C-alpha cells in the first residue's frame, strides 16, 4: 500500500523507494511483484521491486505501462560492491538520455534489441557504502519498451568484456526513477 521512504520485503520481493523529501510522488507496493508510482511535479526520487542480493545471470522480467511527462527512467537498476558501481540497464526513459555526455564503451544485442554501453563517474555523491567517489556503468536500450525479458548476463559480459568489472552484487530491482517530473508507471516483475 501508499508507503514513505524505505527498503524491505513485500510479497516475496525486495523494495525500495527513496525520494529527496521534495514532495509529489505517491509510491505504492502491490501483490506479488507488483508496484506502482504515481508523481506530479516531483524532486528526484527512485523505487522498484527486485532482489536482494541480485545475481550475475538472473533473467528478469517485467510488465506494465509506463507513462512519464519530463525526465524519468524506467530500468533493471543496483549496485555492486567491492569494487563499488552503480548500474543502470536502461529499457525506457523521458526527454532525457541519461547517457548524454558520457563516454561509450561498446554496443551488445540482447533481448530484441541493441544497448549502447556507456560509463560515467559520480564524485563524492550518496552511495549504498556512504559519500564516495564510483563509477556507473550503463546499457540503453535503442528501441523503447514497457515490458520485457532482460537477461543481465548479457550486459554483464559485455561490460567484463570492455573491462567495466563488476564486485559483490547488492540489491538488484525493475525501477522507476524520476527526476522534477511528472508521470505514472504501474510494473510487475518476476
Known sequence: ???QPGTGYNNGYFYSYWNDGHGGVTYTNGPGGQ??????NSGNF??????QPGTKNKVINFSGSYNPNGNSYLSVYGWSRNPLIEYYIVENFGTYNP???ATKLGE???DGSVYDIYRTQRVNQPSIIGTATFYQYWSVRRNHRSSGSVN???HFNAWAQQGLTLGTMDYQIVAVEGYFSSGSASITVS
Not at 35 to 40: A, C, K, P
Request: glycine letters at 16%; hydrophobic letters at 35%.
Open 1 to 3: 500500500q501508499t508507503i
Open 35 to 40: 508496484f506502482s508510482v504515481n508523481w506530479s
Open 46 to 51: 527512485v523505487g522498484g521491486k527486485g532482489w
Open 99 to 101: 547517457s548524454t555526455g
Open 108 to 110: 551488445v544485442t540482447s
Open 152 to 154: 543481465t548476463a548479457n
